[PDB]
Design a protein around this nucleic acid. Structure first.
Lengths: 145, 63
RNA sequence: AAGGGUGCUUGACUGUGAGACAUACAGGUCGAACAGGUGAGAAAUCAGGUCAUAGUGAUCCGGUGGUCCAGUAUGGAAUGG
RNA sequence: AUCAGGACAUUAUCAUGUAGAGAAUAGGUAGGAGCAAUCGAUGCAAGUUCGCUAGGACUUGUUGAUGCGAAAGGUGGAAUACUACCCUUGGUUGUGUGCUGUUCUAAUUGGUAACUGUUAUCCAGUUUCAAGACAGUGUUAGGUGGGCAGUUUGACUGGGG
RNA sequence: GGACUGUUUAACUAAAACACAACUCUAUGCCAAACCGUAAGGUGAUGUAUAUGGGGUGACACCUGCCCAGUGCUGGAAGGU
RNA sequence: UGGACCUAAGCUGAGGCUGAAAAGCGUAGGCGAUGGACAACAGGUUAAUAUUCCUGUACUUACAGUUAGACUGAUGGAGUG
RNA sequence: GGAGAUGGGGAGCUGUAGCGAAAGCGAGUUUUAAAAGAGCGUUUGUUUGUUAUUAUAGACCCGAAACGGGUUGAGCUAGUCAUGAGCAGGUUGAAGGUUGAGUAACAUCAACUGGAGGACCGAACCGACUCUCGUUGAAACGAUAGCGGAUGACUUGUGAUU
RNA sequence: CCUGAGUAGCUCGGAAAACGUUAUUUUGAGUGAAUCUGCCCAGACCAUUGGGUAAGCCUAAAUACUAAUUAGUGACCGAUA
RNA sequence: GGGUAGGUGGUAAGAACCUCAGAUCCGGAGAUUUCCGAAUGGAGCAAUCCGGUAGUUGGAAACAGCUAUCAUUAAUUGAUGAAUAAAUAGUCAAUUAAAGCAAUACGUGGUGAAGUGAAACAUCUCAGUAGCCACAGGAAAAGAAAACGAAUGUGAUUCCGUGUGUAGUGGCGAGCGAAAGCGGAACAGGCCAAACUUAUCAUUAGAUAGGGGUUGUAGGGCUUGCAAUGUGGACUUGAAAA
């Protein structure tokens, strides 16, 4: 229940400081990526510790983003669909790609995928806005059968 | 009954008066809403939360 | 004459009040006499609404002015009498 | 949450005021008889705005030392510039707000559909779909509400009403 | 008089009462509308407007005149509250 | 005639849901004949009953061994019922 | 303390001065300017036992249809649900279909099938339309004699619910 | 450095308090302080003054009654009681 | 153990019994204790049926005897474990609890009517009456000043008279009833979390176990000393005694 953003910038840029007015659940507690800590420390004495924490989170975010981009662009995803004699009858949902990511040893959470559901067969490439500056692009092949 | 799934607070049953001050048996039901919680060792499904407890869990970070 | 008009005005006062009236009560009726301070007329004395007998509903409750009155430990205030 | 417009208001912004006369376009509080000068004149097209139907506050294209008839000249019940205060109207940088119309879901609803529990019309978890700040729910306070609850419907009466 | 096959007030009474196929009208587009309860839940309905609920009349032949003053019902957004 | 064989309306109800409390709802589930399936007839006896006692005539579903033969086969699927 | 009188325990109550609502005053108080008047005053005892009355507790007592909460109740009976059974006997001979004539095809007609009808009579059965009898009857609802329905909205059994 | 926070007060209705909602305690909905020079109480409220230190827990003691067992008792009735 | 000479409960004189080598009876201590019954394997229409398992036995086997085990819920623990990789949920397994009944008596908490009166009645009254549900107890609750209260007042609470029908409250109507104090029975105050610190939680724990600490005649944590060699409990079993 803090008053400071936590490592994810909201709508059109607000700086990293004590500015998030608390409606209670509007977008602050709506996003599960926010801080849960006492308030007496989080006025000025814990500000430097929070800056160090934000730097650590930024660097690990960059490292993990690069790792995921590398392992995604080296290992493209594969599924299969039932075809209407050349027309795509099967359906593909983001649940399937989330499951594949989770099985491949790199869990992707439920709070970064905001794209529409995919409908179609053949090779697809989608640039997923998981990150603002270091986003990734995924390639998927669905076998027609 | 119509009580929240976090604490125990019985609904209020008492007497209400009219413009002529007529004693009538009236009821007040506690303000409960369905809310989702997340914590260790399961117990993450939707429960019933009172607003009085909702504010406390909001500031105390019960998720 | 208690009537007509003329004149001074406003006792169509304040505090009462012995004594009576007739009645379950609530009540209601007259009223000597005194104190103050008045009007009338020189004073005398009168004036406690009309010539009298009909011409209204308590008690709360709430409201207004003033009050030698009280004022939840003290002062006020508030709340009151 | 977000998008847009309008408003209710105002910091700041300038314009904005003619009875008859005053040789003039006069709203009330004043020191007040000088001051405008690259805070560059007068003349030349006039505009933002006012608009009474006559012009005004300022100005740019030009301009280069002109003057001000509104100090002073005199006027009216109100008399002039330099400037301290304040009224009518129009705008008006700026915010506080809700309201009108909306976009999105991640809150939330579901007797959309699917998977597992479970070889189960329920239910549990998950996904999907339609919605989506609404509905429902809680309270407060309205409007409506003989479906229901409680009661009331006086007395004398030369029979009762 | 009512169309009738019929329902009947056990233990006073069967019709000119009710009933009926039918006719008429209103409301209802799915968590239908309505109803039970408080709520889960449940019928309607494992239904979809040629259907359902409710209102009125009651084979068939022919007609159902006027009036929205008042009440209701609906629509209405200007103005007063 | 029945149960150990099976259900209809129905009953209860782990869970679970709702509900001031007791409690109500309802799923898998388990019960629930008035039915379905299911293999006995003739005669005789006793104060008293009897296709149950007896006589003769029968049959079925069961278990094990044995002989002989064959690839059989559900807690599932279909027909049947 | 034989659960005794009692002893102890004086906490409180009466009267001992009152006036009023009071600041307070005081054999005076309040009303009033009043020392005017008026009112109230101007000590006249306490505790028990007893009787009667009165007050609340059911309070001389008997008496109702009352009201509220809880509870058993579908086997009487109403309706519904799943599931058997039954309707004798006698009548009528629809629609429909067939054949032929017929008509351009139809339609129509004559003969045939056919057994249908909230069709008819009338046992069982169901209900009770009427006269008499009885009305402390045999019976807290019946008896002879007749009655209607009596193939369908027909009756009824079983078990279950409200 | 510390002294019990969605805490107290407050608003809309209440309940308990002699109490009909009034100081005092509490809540169905909302609300949001204090840090010991604190904060609360002193039948609204303030200043002054005095008293007090909650919002965590526990605590036999006196007191109500004998369905039941034991010993004894009754100015209790003596089989229409 | 006491413990004696007749006894074998009663409609039964009896018959058959046994008996002073010490019965019976009485009092303790046990065992036994068919079935139903919260009922607990499933059901059931109460004292009934059908049962599952692990063994024992007759038998070639079925079958049939003999035992014990076999409800649900909550907590703990371990394992398996889908949607969903993992983990969960769920499933299985093992351990522990009340689970129920009854004294019309209470006590606590919750729910929650009426008529009576006002010679009417709605506010009110009886009344949080009765009643219903849950709880535990033989006693319970209430209990330590955010107490009272207006006095150089007291210093847990509970209960009895008094205060007192006082001050008052209520269509100021019916009605309703104090708060202190006094006389009394009895009269113990304690235990936690926090700042502060130690060891353990991938020691980001913001948790675990410790020293400390229960505050207004303010006190504790903090830095820093002298002391004090104990008392009472709200309190452990051993031994004896009465």
């Amino acid at each position: 229940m803090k008053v400071i953003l936590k490592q994810d910038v909201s709508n059109l840029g607000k700086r990293f400081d004590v500015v998030d007015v608390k409606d209670g659940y509007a977008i602050h507690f709506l996003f599960p990526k926010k801080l849960a800590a006492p308030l007496t420390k989080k006025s000025l004495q814990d500000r430097d510790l929070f800056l160090k924490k934000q730097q650590e989170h930024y660097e690990i975010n960059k490292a993990l983003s690069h790792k995921l981009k590398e392992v995604i662009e080296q290992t493209e995803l594969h599924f299969s669909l039932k075809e209407h004699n050349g027309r795509p009858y099967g359906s593909i949902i983001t649940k399937q790609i989330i499951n594949q990511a989770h099985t491949k040893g790199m869990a992707l959470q439920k709070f970064m995928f905001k794209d529409n559901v995919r409908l179609g067969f053949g090779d697809h490439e989608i640039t997923l806005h998981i990150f603002e500056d270091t986003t990734a692009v995924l390639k998927v092949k669905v076998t027609p059968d | 009954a119509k009580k929240d799934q976090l604490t125990l607070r019985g609904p209020l049953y008492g007497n209400n008066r009219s413009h002529s001050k007529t004693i009538t048996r009236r009821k007040w039901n506690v303000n409960l809403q369905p809310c989702k919680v997340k914590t260790a060792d399961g117990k993450t499904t939707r429960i019933l939360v009172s607003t009085r407890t909702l504010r406390t869990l909001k500031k105390h970070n019960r998720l």
